[PDB]
Amino acid sequence: TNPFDNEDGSFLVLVNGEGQHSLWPAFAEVPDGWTGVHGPASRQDCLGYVEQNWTDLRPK
Amino acid sequence: STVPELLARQVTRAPDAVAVVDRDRVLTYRELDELAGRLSGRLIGRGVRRGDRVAVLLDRSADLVVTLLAIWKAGAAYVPVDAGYPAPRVAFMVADSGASRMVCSAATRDGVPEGIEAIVVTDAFEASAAGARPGDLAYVMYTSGSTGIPKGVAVPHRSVAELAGNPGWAVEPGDAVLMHAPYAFDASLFEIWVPLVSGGRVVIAEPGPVDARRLREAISSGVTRAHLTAGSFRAVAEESPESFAGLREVLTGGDVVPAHAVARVRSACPRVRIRHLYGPTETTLCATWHLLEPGDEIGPVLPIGRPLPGRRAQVLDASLRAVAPGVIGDLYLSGAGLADGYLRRAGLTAERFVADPSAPGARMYRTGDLAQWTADGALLFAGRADDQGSHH
Ligand SMILES: N[C@H](C(=O)O)c1ccc(O)cc1
Ligand SMILES: N[C@H](C(=O)O)c1ccc(O)cc1
């Protein structure tokens, strides 16, 4: 199972300088240029955070 | 960059070169630009503003090329709808993309959904352009992948231009590219925009499917490059591979293409370049490719190949670590060409357009496919991750 699809995984939400959001498996080092803004939390919780807070896909 | 900016360089360089051939209608570069400018003025006059989505419901034709460029010149993004789609599918695409207007023809006029302004392309505003910008959306193309749920892939101008202007296409002013793919699918980016940013011409195929006989006729009339879906390529390769003779390059991709089909074409046509393309709508037509030069023979396996110039690929395991060659892992695509995401679906975007551990602040697209590297850095396809039940 791909780790981004693991419903039993622990996840972060990350945001880059352009305001783009990414789910991220909590076991992996956070890539350079990205900041954790939510989690560790369930996969579904992270999707809810993104849907609520990322309202314009356009890079800032 | 933007495709209109790249096109403008060609209009300046050779305004009287042929841009579009449609039956007996021939448009030069300058004529195409002027027609699109007039239709852009009409669109602005109907209230189209920067960032708007404008649906398009047209048969392939010179008017279609004019319309897409006009939408772009008005600062808007096009939402291509196949005139043969059922009405509920059309209604969904228009509503989900947020399009309030649709460009259509007399023949397709009845397919505009209720409540949507129809702009009939064949019907006094003056030419006017707001201008395309690299960060603005260029189009929203719908994909269901292997899910069955259609999502709108929102692609910015910069990504379309990175694809269309890529130096690897090797399309020149003397080239003539056959146009027959649905403009709702992104193979149309090669058939329309690559020749126009290169100085070549777009040859609109007669209505109906392009078969071996029609391909031979198009080549006799001057077509030099043609893309076929994997299914059509496999059929012609096995049935009539000599029908590709005279092309400078044949291209194919989408579904799996077996090496045997490529070998049949090379045997019949030693001097034709054969290019295999791979990539999802989410990363603008293709992210990797494999080119067989004239005289060279394909191995037992046809790679999906190497990343296009300006792109990168990674094969990662379940811990997100890069695997060594000969190891099958998850394929991720990065560098140029990524879509902004899925319109109105930020959560889905955030689980597929993910942070790239190898490039600061950047994203990579999780293809959902499996792949392995060869020892010298090409990629072999290993099936969809959700289809491994078919591999035995
Ligand atoms: N194969 C599915 C699809 O085409 O919808 C898919 C799953 C995960 C992913 O990251 C991309 C695609
Ligand atoms: N981008 C599509 C796809 O999603 O598969 C594609 C079409 C034709 C091609 O040769 C490669 C890719």
Residue numbers in the entry:
A (entry chain D): 2 to 61
B (entry chain A): 9 to 131, 134 to 402
Quote the study's own text.
Since ANC1-3 domains display polydisperse elution profiles in size exclusion chromatography, we instead turned to the characterisation of an Acore construct of the Hpg accepting A1 domain from Tei biosynthesis (A1tei), which possesses a homologous pocket to ANC1. The MbtH-like domain Tcp13 also exhibits the anticipated fold, containing a 3-stranded antiparallel β-sheet and an α-helix adjoining the centre of the sheet.
The aromatic ring of L-Hpg is stabilised by hydrophobic interactions with the sidechain of L295 and the main chain of G264, whilst the phenol moiety of L-Hpg is hydrogen bonded to H237 and to the amide nitrogen of G263. A water mediated interaction between E201 and the imidazole Nπ further contributes to imidazole positioning. This Glu residue is widely conserved among NRPS A-domains and serves to maintain the desired orientation of the loop immediately prior to the key α-amino coordinating acidic residue (D196 in A1tei).
